[PDB]
Amino acid sequence: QFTAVGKEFNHLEKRIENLNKKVDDGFLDIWTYNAELLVLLENERTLDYHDSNVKNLYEKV
Amino acid sequence: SSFERFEIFPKTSSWPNHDSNKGVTAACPHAGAKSFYKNLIWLVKKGNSYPKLSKSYINDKGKEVLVLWGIHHPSTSADQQSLYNADTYVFVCSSRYSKKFKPEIAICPKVRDQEGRMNYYWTLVEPGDKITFEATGNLVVPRYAFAMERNASGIIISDTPVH
């Protein structure tokens, strides 16, 4: 989605400031975690796949 | 998407009973000379009277118009009397917006060689709406407004070059 992540608050709006920051940091954490795992898990499967193909080639022979 | 700046209340014609030249200060120097904002006019009394001010503007532009004005708050009553009247008010209202202002006269901490204050106000005028300014003093008046249409973005604070 089209987003402008940035926001500006004054010296009397510290609470929504920290609400905004909580939104940015909660999404950061979710994405970071998911992206790391998605890689770790698909990398396992890829390498298994490659092993799987060789095996099937040798087995066919 | 459709921004433009236009003279809303011409200096030459809009203020016949008031002074529009003497509205400069050392706080806003131009060429090292006492100046003021280009988009607002600081009105001072003409001769020795500041008659009830009454000016209105209908938005003929096919879009929203952005109006800004200022309320002046002098430090001393001697200063107040010399620029403008003793008991004064400023009144602005459209069909949507409406606020009265009351000049708080007081000696504040000195900022930029200035012991007075000037509060800055703004509102959006609907396409086809009327906005009325009324005053007996202290009103920094609009000279330039902006016509526009918005698009649902942000602000970057950077030293990074443009290309």
Next chain:
Amino acid sequence: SYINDKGKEVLVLWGIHHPSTSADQQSLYNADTYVFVCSSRYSKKFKPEIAICP
């Protein structure tokens, strides 16, 4: 004044009138006036801004 005898929160609404002219103001109501509302929690004074609006 009104004490809330209902066993729950009560919602109160009121309005402040701002006439266009002093001739109108005088004819409905006095020249210098005020409205004051306060509970144990809420408290506000109101001051009639008399002016000709759009």
